[model samples]
Target chain A: IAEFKEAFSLFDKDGDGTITTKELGTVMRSLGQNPTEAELQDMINEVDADGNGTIDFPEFLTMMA
Target chain B: GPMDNLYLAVLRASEGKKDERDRVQKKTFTKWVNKHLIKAQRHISDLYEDLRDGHNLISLLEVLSGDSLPREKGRMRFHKLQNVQIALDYLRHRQVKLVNIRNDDIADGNPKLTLGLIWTIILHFQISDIQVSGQSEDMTAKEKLLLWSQRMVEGYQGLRCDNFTTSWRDGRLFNAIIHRHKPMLIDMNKVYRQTNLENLDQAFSVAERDLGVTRLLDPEDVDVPQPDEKSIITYVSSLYDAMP
Candidate 1:
């Protein structure tokens, strides 16, 4: 979980307390994946439990764990 | 000139076989290069031709080695050699074998040696980097990796990874490795019973989406009758690198 916090901090680029699709795209791109818009949407939708179209720390934890 | 016709036929048959081998080898190695290149937001269109200049080659080395290599400013003939030599020297410093490889050979885009040079890089950085605990001292890098796979997925119900070729055809071993590494991500009972392609893609995306393992092999890459061993070693090493 400590590692997940560090990972979440890295992805929460704006640090607005939630990882938006835009932030997530940058993270994936930095990792060498060319994530398509649809790919990102599907992944984000998979764990965006609140349906706010972004992943908060808890949602990101769910995605990771 | 009349006798040369028979010689031409002999040469054609031999070159045909070698050409087929090079084509397959070149495709997999090029994809491996691009897979690392994309991390820098930089890529090359042609492995043989694109790496001719050496800047892209240095960029690839930078990402892999985690150190910045000085790049030549412009594309002069000497500058090209200088750049290629930097990559060559970097590998040399890393103790990578350089038997017949010359800087200008790479700077000038010698296709056969270029492929050899790339294979050398794959051997040094990817294959040789694998270290399994208590592995035999004399085991080859590929076998150690094969052992790594066998050990990781050991006792996972009904998975077998006898070789990097036919053993991985069904992709159950790939999933089992991941499930061992991260138990939360895969359901062994469900994945083991899945179809060939389904299990393969499941392992790949699970590696990517969850564990941050780069997607090196696809379902098609693994579903072949016999997959390329060198390429499989490189991909499996990435999974081990990602795991622990």
Candidate 2:
């Protein structure tokens, strides 16, 4: 769980407690996964059950699960 | 056609010594093509040989099919033909057969089959490991990147090429790959584009000091004036000296 938080904070960048699509895209590419913007949006749409437009820790956990 | 156009374009620029230019251009083209395309050609030829050697059951099926093949020459014997279209058609048929049998194998081990895919796989493993380790620490993203950057720089230097002073610069691919993961690093491209160990130290020092991160090379050790203007060769040697 702490490792997941660190991963989330690594992508959050601005310490806003939520991850934006661009942040996720950049982080994904840095991790050697070339996810297209639409693919990233699709990922968020699938995981963002709260429909908050940004991925919170619970959504990140769900996606990881 | 593109190759022809490229030759023509180069030829048009040749003034008095056109033959000299043409010879050099031919050499360059041959070298480049051999570097990039010869592997693919060799792979295709190898594929043909493998199919011919009964790697697939379909090759055997082609023998049993009711074509009026020459009886004297036995099965799978080739008659010499000068016709281009017929030879091409023959090759195409074999190619289709090969593809039909080979697609599953290629997909099952895509990276193992191709150089590009292999490189991508290596890049993925390196980047994924770095990303995971970087995130699992107390360091900030930039700090993690800088820490790894120093380690990468020292690691390249440790390889000990002939020109010990400038040898680390030859590892442009390593530097570029690491930089892609951490462009937030200060003057990261300096280490990527050129072989400046001081810039590496400066960037690495910032990561340590700003984020209170610790690495093998302390800030004092890196920031101090070395006898060789912070030459990577000497720094790397000292690092090994301190290591077990």
Candidate 3:
């Protein structure tokens, strides 16, 4: 769906084919829903599918979509 | 207890006349309130700016509830903008009630000296907010609270007869009933109107004991669908005539 595509496109900030905590925190705070320090780390834990402590495009897609 | 502790702490912190220390503490309270308000206003502005830019504002509540809660926060543990809005509504409504009380006090043939007493107390207490401190009939800040308690009593009576039903449009009473128990909310508003003349807390305990919680609504499914905030605001603005 276009909705998924749009959400994915917006979230994938660096165009390096991935999303990261810095990028997510920026987005969240910009939206006035700023993540606490703990929340940022939690996001990495929850959405990092590959266990590399980082989110690739595929993991981002699954988590957000 | 917190209020008492806070007073004691203020006394301990200050090395001055009790009156002077009280003044400083009062100023600190106002500053604290202003700080939070400015914070809320800026935060809400940021949210609006982001939404304007077509960004999906997904916060903790969004992750948990699948719906974005607006950024406005109030004095209470307001998890959503709706909670903030309702609290603001109560403040505004109470302000109007105060103006009415003031007018009544001035207009009465006998003009119950209660109005003068109320105004004196307001000045003594340094309660700045008109809605919270201003009053009618007696013109006392405490009287305002008493009036609200009295309204709770009447609301209880109304609930008994099913005469208190307001149209369910913008979800004022509904949300209130959902969060705080109905009788409490009614008693609060009742106290807003009538003051400490009624034993609302005791009255509601007796009534609820006999009648139980009014099940006007069926339990909502945890997974059921509901409209989002934008949809809700848009609907209320377009359809409901300034929802109570």
Candidate 4:
């Protein structure tokens, strides 16, 4: 649980407790993975159930689960 | 070739704090030059010396690409071809073989990778477009094969761990040798066990100071809590728990 939260913090970027689309893209790129803009949107669309354009912890958990 | 600098450039282009990116780039570059490049240089020299003027690049090619390249039934073999340089070039750009097994599986009680077979595999691994000092310049196919081979041996040594699965072990060794990353030696279970033992030691010390001084608790009196599987960190670990 502690490690998972730390991982989330590393990707959060702005300390906002939610990961924005740009943040997700940055994290993927850092891991040497390149995802297209459409791909990025598709990822968020799957996890961002609230349709708020960003991923909160619950949304992130859903993706991991 | 710029191919060597490509990974560092990718890290540079990715998002990160400036110092962090710089730190990783420098560390990676230092490892590549110091460990990888040096190993490649050594291997090329050794192999050339071992041939003792009996073989040159052309003869080595003949040995490798000819039917003489060792193989066993039901195992991957380097495709036979006429040109040593061309065949080596083919493997340099090719995806790795035995995606499910370790390169060392040939050594770890698996007769498939015999001494001759290991050389064949390592020889193929050693041929790559290695750049000098992060430059855009490239080595000749002959030069590149020598460099890649020399650099690969040490990195191969680094990939070894007592706990890796045969397939996972070789898979990582293959990836490390090919991609030029230093093999990270890690076994999370071992680490977890060590950490737990440390925790147990701490508990014993605490009892000695607070409880032992007053009551002198016997060694057999206390029961230490066992570490659960969840205690192991898995984020980047190979997670080779399935191995015997």
Candidate 5:
């Protein structure tokens, strides 16, 4: 769980307790993965409905685990 | 018909020049691809041949995008196109602008499409994410990046970077960028007066060795009549990240 936390904490630049794929996009490149804004947007748009357009850690955890 | 035939047949010289450009582009782009492929433990010998199956193409984007797309495990031609199109669809989702490249063209190792595909990927994945500071709110990304370089090395003596092409030919601008930020790392007076080849050689080696920037452009790549713009930008994109 902390493995996911470490990744999430680093990407959550604003520290607002939730993250956007924008943060995911930024983190991806920093980790040497070249993510495009469009793909990240598409990924989040698929999952966002009542979440007010951001991803919480549980949401992130679901995607990964 | 003979006159028209002559018009077509005698176009060989231009075709020769055009083909020569692909050769140079292929080598530089191959190196650029491997730089990322190393992370994924995948490499390609011929850009034309390796991507024909779309296996490396998929792997390249996976390395670049940090996303995975499923590939069909089969030897059928249908499977090959499915994999190739899967990668292309991912590029589209990333809003990586494409020209008229058909999915089959890449799977068949078509040079124009293959080179154009890599060139397109180079700009999007390699050069697209640069953060140009203090811009006046509106310029193309290339314009912002070029302006950022101008501001970075604006007043350095004996260096002119008016454009990414010929201006950076001498390797002096590169050393100047590094020496400007990481001043203690390079000796400017010593670097400035060396041969272009030596200057370029040492600049790449020193940056890769000391500053953690990878060696991207060769001396020949930069000193050529028209250096590939995307290659230079992709290489320059790392310098700021390395400086601090």
Candidate 6:
């Protein structure tokens, strides 16, 4: 669970409590991986869970933890 | 790879904390890593015990094979196809095989799986792919043989596709997981007395890096190449199944 939190925190940009494309991509790129634009959108769509474009804390929590 | 960076970030984040670094702390996060590490170490130790005592993955190959036969996966897709019946019969027969193995193992004084472990592993292996309707009665042996024969090709193709998907999604997750676990695994390998431990670590690292870059580069293109499988089967089949 804590591992998930650590991973999610890195993905969560702005510290505004949710993830955006820029935030996730930045971390992803930093990791030497690049998801296609479609891939990024798909991840946000599938994992966001709440149907919100941005990922909230709860959605991020369940994905990793 | 980025995973290396992530690990460094994790370590750095753990070294210390300053005022307002409340999001994560070095000590707490390190504790999490260690806790999970110890838990994993124990799990692997149990697997080691099993492997030592003759409970082994190779034995499970038959179990895996029964789930997806060599023949059913390939030519069936090209030859006379049974469609739903092949999958259903293979699935049922494989279940019986696994059950028999477990029962015989127990009867032979081998440790029986805990219900949970059996359910956990077998349940994941218990795939639900086919959707069959009608056929109130069970399939006969002739039908079973036909199905199994077809399944060899079908099974291989299915394995190809399954392997492909795994190489994509879970493949990414897999690289991430190895990235997460490798350091500890390397350390463990040092003391575990496994054969060719040093080379194994080198091999493991190479495989991880290869797979990681493979995943990151396209993630889709990292699929199991078709030529590899074809040449492999052809090589073996030549030794035995070549025309006389």
Per-residue lDDT of model 1, residues B1-244, tens digit only: 1233212322343355456556666776787888889988887777778888788889999988899898898768888888888899999998989889998788777877888898888888878878888699899887788888889988877778888778888888888889888899999888857899999999989998998877766677678776767667767888888877
Residue lDDT tens for model 6, A1-65: 66556555666656788888777667767656776777676667766667879777787656544
Best by DockQ: 4
Task: For candidate 6, write residues B1-244 as lDDT tens digits.
Answer: 0123333332333332211122112222222223223433422223213322222232332344443333223333232233223323344555633443332232233332322222223323422222223322575422332232233324222222222123222222222223333434333333233333333333335443543211112222223322122111111122111111
Each model's TM-score for chain A is 0.85, 0.80, 0.73, 0.84, 0.67, 0.80
Model 4 spans with C-alpha error above 4 angstroms: B1-244
Local accuracy of candidate 4 as per-residue lDDT tens digits, B129-213:
2333323355553343334334443434434422212212123322333234312333323323444334333333432343321
Taken over the whole model, the C-alpha lDDT of each candidate is: 0.78, 0.39, 0.34, 0.37, 0.76, 0.36
Clashes of each: 0, 0, 20, 10, 1, 22
lDDT string for model 5 (A1-65, tens) is 87467556655889988877777677656545665777676656554545677877776666555
Candidate 6 residues lying further than 4 Å off, grouped into runs, are: B1-244
Candidate with the larger DockQ of 4 and 6: 4
Error of 3 at A33 (Å): 1.6
Mark the 10 consecutive residues where model 4 chain B has the least summed lDDT.
B227-236
lDDT (10s digit) by residue, model 4, range A1-65: 65446556766889999977688778777767787878777666666679998878776655544
For lDDT, the strongest prediction is: 1
RMSD in angstroms between candidate 1 and the native structure over all alpha carbons: 22.1
Tens digit of per-residue lDDT, candidate 5, span B126-205: 56666677876767677877877887787788677788788878888888888888788889888867878887888898
Q: Is the docking of candidate 5 incorrect, acceptable, medium or high quality?
A: incorrect
Which of the two candidates, 2 or 4, achieves a greater lDDT against the reference? 2
Candidate 1 error regions (>4 Å): A1-65, B1-24
Interface RMSD of each: 27.6, 22.5, 20.4, 11.9, 25.8, 7.9
How does residue B7 of candidate 2 score in lDDT?
19
